[PDB]
Design a protein around this ligand. Structure first.
Ligand SMILES: N[C@@H](Cc1ccccc1)C(=O)O
Ligand SMILES: [Mg+2]
Ligand SMILES: [Mg+2]
Ligand SMILES: [Zn+2]
Lengths: 49, 79, 96, 63
RNA sequence: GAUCGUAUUGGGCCUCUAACCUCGGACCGUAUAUCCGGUUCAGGGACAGUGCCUGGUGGGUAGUUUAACUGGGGCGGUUGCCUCCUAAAAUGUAACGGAGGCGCCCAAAGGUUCCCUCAACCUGGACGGCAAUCAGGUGUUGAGUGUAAGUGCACAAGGGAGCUUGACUGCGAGACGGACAUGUCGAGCAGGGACGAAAGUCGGGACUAGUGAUCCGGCACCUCUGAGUGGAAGGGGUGU
RNA sequence: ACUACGAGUAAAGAUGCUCGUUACGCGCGGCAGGACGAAAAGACCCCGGGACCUUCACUACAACUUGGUAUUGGUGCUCG
RNA sequence: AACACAGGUCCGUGCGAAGUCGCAAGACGAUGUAUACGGACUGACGCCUGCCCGGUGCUGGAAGGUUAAGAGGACCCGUU
RNA sequence: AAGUCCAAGAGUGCGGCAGUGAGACGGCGGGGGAUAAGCUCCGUGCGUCGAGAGGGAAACAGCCCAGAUCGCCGGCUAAG
RNA sequence: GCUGUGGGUAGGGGUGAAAGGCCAAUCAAACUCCGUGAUAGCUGGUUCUCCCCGAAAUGCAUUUAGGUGCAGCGUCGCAUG
RNA sequence: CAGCGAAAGCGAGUCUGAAUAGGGCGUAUCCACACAAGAGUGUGUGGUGUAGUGGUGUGUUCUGGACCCGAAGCGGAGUG
RNA sequence: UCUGCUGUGAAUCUGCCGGGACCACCCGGUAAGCCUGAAUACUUCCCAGUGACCGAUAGCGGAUUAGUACCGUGAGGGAA
RNA sequence: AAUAUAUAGGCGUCUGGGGGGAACGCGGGGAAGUGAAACAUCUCAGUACCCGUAGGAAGAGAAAACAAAAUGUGAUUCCG
């Protein structure tokens, strides 16, 4: 699988906002990324679920 | 008694769509192309996949600039 | 001819039907104005007499046309525009 | 014998206030990750059934 | 946490007879009866057989499926997508015609700001040599661009560094292409951000492959519905 | 139908078409070169559909079989 | 030159047998009883019939692994 | 910008009813083949046959002239 | 061994010293009636007249290639000229 | 004879959306006048005003053997 | 909700059953006993009539010896 | 009777049944060709056929029913 499908949720309201792909062998850790979260209405940090 | 060939892709219908002198609206696709065989001129933009599209109404005009082939839109006047 | 037919290769239309839907038969203030030049009380009985709505249905009144007569309307439901237009001409929008 | 309406056609197609026949667009149920949002946004909503399919769609809907 | 009596409850074992069984004997219905039923003796015995539920073996039987293309069929080979030639200087164009590639990869190889110019050759240099690292000169594109081929790119889309997540949400005038279903580009508006002094650029990657309609179902969220009513189950919407 | 031959032409092997050559009308007995002679909507080959046969093709079923429960009960040891 | 055949070997069957025809009762086998009956292969007679139990069957054994229904109802949820 | 314009019986949009989806040869540009085939696969505001009679090529769908509303015991021509 | 008379076995069944043999001149599953006017992307046939117009044998898809759907090309009506 | 929306619902509007900010669908159609724009025209005031339905002829079509003829074969019950 | 087979197996009205899983409340009814006309379906047969139904290859297979002659072992087929 | 109670069984007498019928009813068993452009779920179709039984008709029928807050209907059957 090597490059699986991950889903990123807003850290505040825990809404699954985005789905993307990452190399698990290169990035064994969860992906920290700042993304726009609609209901929060502002850019909040996101973490892989 | 068999060939290793025989497979091909579809034609992508590239080429010039509006030739010199034609009147276009804003946003019309003027030429579909792979590279920058034609470069954008005045009031002409460049798409992600390298198609040139009009940015403003007028009449298409081809030209050159420092050895580069360009496409421009000429502001046709009021009636 | 064998390929996936048009009715099978498209998504089904979204949603459900809600069999508990309350459906109304609607009449506009313009039609009331045309049909009642002299004004007067206007209920469901005379609204079906002048042939404006169906016989034994639920009537809601909508504010499309112009109302220029004094009229006393009674109906199951009224829209905001219809109620304002009836009231402005000195009429009552009595709701059943 | 009465004429029976096609069930799939009834579930897939609807009509507007003037008689336009209306359908939905495909390629949207799943595998949505690699589809960009621009392509996703042109694939929703409704579109008018193309003039080629008008006759057959009307036949299936009426009887 | 280990032991005994009061209780129920199941498992295992050996028995017992009264259910049930016996094509074991004898008497009767019966004059004729190797049927049948009854009486009784002799044995098995809560097993077997049978009903319902359940797992296995099951060509013994049954209904069927077992692709198309094709210089006849079979065997061989192929089937979707991308690039070039054939293709006759717009577009399109066939053959079991000529050559290749794909079913990925990158958390930076994306966004932005700023700076830079390769390959090759000549000369001189400790190991060091044709070719490692250093210096000077000639060098306009012959290097390189994640990956095929073509069109591009030196104004750089090629090389380097700082910051960063737009690899956004709601949309979208106008177009290309098209049997249809698919597919493609897009200025610009709002929100909320990155970079930048600013102008401005940013809805992934120089571009074109890297994929799968519908049905059916899973998960998360929503100010939708809820079969007398309040809930709920189920169903809807949005994302996947 | 008062149904010649040759060299050609034609759906590529002509009594019937072209140019020529030959031949009085009608029968009888014979021979089998042609009328792609007669008979049988090719059995070969292919395409579509059957049927029957096979098997570690698929899905089922009879049959055989496993356990639970009912018909089904009692006294004793023994384990939980 | 095929089938059968007398002769051979193996397998099954302890007796309303095994096998078979029948949903069953019943029947044949047989008014027989392993020197009998059924199935399979070989085919008078003579000399003989070699090696392999991995595959797939058949027979025997459960110490493990997996495994249905039925027993069991911890925990959770809806209602109030 | 004109031309044709009491016609091409032209284009475009919608609707009722279709048939077709086995093409052939000839001229030019090509592929496959041996730069063979009355071969095969393509391009062509190219043609004809198909669906087309009449004249010529002796006969001779696809070549050349020429598109048959009917009659005439009139004339002029095309290819030949 | 042949044979006469009488009787028995029935269709996915019988019978077969085994040939796919025989079971009323037919047997790789008899015959009759019924389901039934089976189905057939295939072959054949489809009957009076004249007037006007007049094709296609191409593209895409196809368990598809001798079938079919949509488009292309015909006709009739309406609109636009 | 009112439409829009998955729906609650609202209604000449409605859905999406944070949006008087764009878009989708709808308000028969035309005419005149203003306001804006020449991103293709839009928005407002007036008028004129909206056509369906029921019989029946015709062409297609649906369900029925469905324009007519034609298999090999498949089931049920019986006769040999 | 109704209902077949196999198990398990309740209460007599503050009971029990239905209001599309289920729970609470309200509503409706009172299962495990039995009878019942008319409105509805059909014509072997009898009587009286009708037809923009056939007129002897039609109409029933049968206007005449008709289920006759004939065919088949039989079921059955079946005329002029 | 075996066998004691007795029962099975035996003997005598009265009352019924049995078979046929074109359609229609009720209750049971229950196909396949066919369609799905293949086929098994599905369809054909509870059809064809078969079995038991009636009657002049049969079946069903007098709420453990509908309904939805209406101070609403009130057995069954059949028709739109
Ligand atoms: N044997 C021929 C066909 C055929 C059969 C019988 C007779 C004649 C000819 C082929 O090949
Ligand atoms: Mg390859
Ligand atoms: Mg072994
Ligand atoms: Zn959030």
């Amino acid at each position: 699988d090597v490059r699986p499908k991950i889903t990123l949720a807003c850290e505040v309201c825990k809404h699954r906002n985005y789905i993307t792909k990452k190399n698990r062998r290169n990035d064994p850790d969860r992906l920290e990324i700042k993304k726009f979260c609609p209901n929060c209405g502002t850019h909040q940090p996101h973490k892989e679920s | 008694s068999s060939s290793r060939n025989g497979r091909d892709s579809a034609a992508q219908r590239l080429g010039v769509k509006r030739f010199g002198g034609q009147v276009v609206k804003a946003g019309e696709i003027l030429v579909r192309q792979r590279g920058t065989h034609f470069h954008p001129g005045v009031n002409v933009g460049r798409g992600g996949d390298d198609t040139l599209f009009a940015l403003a109404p007028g009449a298409v005009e081809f030209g050159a600039k420092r050895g580069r082939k360009t496409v421009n839109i000429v502001p046709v006047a009021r009636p | 001819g064998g390929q996936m037919p048009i009715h099978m290769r498209l998504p089904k239309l979204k949603g459900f039907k809600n069999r508990f839907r309350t459906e109304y038969q609607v009449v506009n203030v313009g039609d009331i104005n045309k049909a009642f030049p002299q004004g007067g009380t206007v209920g469901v009985d005379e609204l079906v007499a002048k042939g404006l709505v169906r016989k034994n249905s639920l009537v809601k009144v909508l504010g499309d046309g112009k109302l220029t007569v004094k009229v006393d309307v009674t109906a199951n439901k009224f829209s905001g525009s219809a109620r304002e237009a009836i009231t402005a001409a000195g009429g009552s929008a009595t709701e059943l | 014998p009465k004429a029976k309406t096609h069930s799939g056609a009834s579930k897939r197609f609807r009509r507007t206030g003037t008689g336009k026949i209306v359908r939905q667009k495909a390629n949207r149920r799943h595998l949505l990750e690699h589809k960009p949002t621009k392509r996703t946004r042109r694939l929703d909503g409704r579109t008018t059934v193309s003039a080629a399919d008008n006759s057959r769609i009307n036949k299936l809907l009426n009887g």
